[PDB]
Amino acid sequence: DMGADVANLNNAISTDSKPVATTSQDKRSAEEILNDVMENYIDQNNLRDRYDYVGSAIGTASVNQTNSNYVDSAQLAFEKALIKAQAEYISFISANALDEAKLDNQLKEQGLNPNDFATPEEKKKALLSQQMTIKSLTTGFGNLSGLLPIKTFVVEKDGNAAIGVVVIYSDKIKGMFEDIKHGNGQSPSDLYKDKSGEDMMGDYGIRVGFGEDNKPYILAYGQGSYSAGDYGYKQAAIMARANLVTLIAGQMSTQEALTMSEDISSRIDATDIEKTLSTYYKTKANLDIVGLKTVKRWRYKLPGTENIVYGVVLKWDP
């Protein structure tokens, strides 16, 4: 049963996501503000008692002088945060003819040099070690489809836009997508009740929810900037769509997971996993997403400035 999380995932969608406020007297850096608000969110919601894994990560990007590229910079910041969170989860998972000539062949197959070892026992262990490392990574990449964002936060400081993302891992979510691949509550427009523009500013990425009919759906957030509304909503859908493309790419085949694990091996450093993963997302091919309905549109004029941010919430049914 999905029981428990139906209210966890749906309530997470419904919480306000205002830009994190920060007084002039607050001496914290963007990273400290985000860590504090994410740690508090994780604790006050008892997320570690609810999920087997809970993680958090931050990404930052510069904005221009007039802050006119805020939306683009913020989205980039989210992308880095997400990828960092994914890489840390994988890293965490990774931590927790004579006989002799056939061994040598197996070492060479894995890129190792048999001469670098002096005993057959030394060759045998270097080999089993390579295999456990590949096994670990394959399990980690395969589980990404269960690593889901549940809350994002945004902070602007010192000429940057910084995004924090809290992710949770769920076997059921992993299993739902695999079953969705072939096998087999409240409305989305109803979860965005009187959620104003300001309340949506901190929402980045995708979310999984469940409607009236007990059916899962995926929401994707997006923002744009410049009547010019016509244009802002259009560009906001570009970002929301890219969020879905990245989601789908992350649900890779077992063979794609193996190739990446082999390609990396030539605990494991998350920084190494992160570039390899970033590479994979940039190179993976497109796949026109079908049936995307807009379930929310909003507009928020930035305080003190003349700039306006537009946003959309798209719903995709897989």
Name the residue ranges covered by the structural domains of the chain.
1-318
d(CA 123, CA 112): 9
Give the CA-trace dihedral at 276, 278, 280, 286, to 10 degrees. Answer: 180
* Nearest alpha-carbon partner for 195 in 161, 162, 163, 219: 219
Q: Which two tokens stand for residue 67?
A: 């802050």
d(CA 12, CA 6): 10
Beta strand residue intervals within 143-194, DSSP E: 147-157, 160-169
Distances (CA, A) of 119 to 73, 110, 128, 150, 197: 54, 18, 14, 50, 67
Distances (CA, A) of 288 to 240, 245, 285, 293: 13, 9, 10, 14
Resolution of the experimental structure, in angstroms: 2.3
261 CB-side CA count, 13 A:
24
Query: For tokens 């299993």, what's the residue?
Result: 175
d(CA 187, CA 179): 23
Beta strand residue intervals within 143-252, DSSP E: 147-157, 160-169, 206-210, 216-225
49 CB-side CA count, 13 A:
4
**Burial (CB count <10 Å: 0-12, 13-18, 19+), residue 285:** exposed
d(CA 81, CA 30): 13
* Nearest alpha-carbon partner for 82 in 291, 243, 265, 241: 243
d(CA 310, CA 275): 31
The experimental technique used to determine this model is X-ray
d(CA 227, CA 26): 38
d(CA 225, CA 231): 8
d(CA 232, CA 273): 35
d(CA 149, CA 246): 13
* Nearest alpha-carbon partner for 300 in 16, 15, 11, 12: 16
Q: Residue-wise over 129-154: b if at least 16 C-beta within 10 A, else e?
A: ebeebbebbbebbbbbbbbbbbbbbb
Query: For tokens 């306006």, what's the residue?
Result: 308
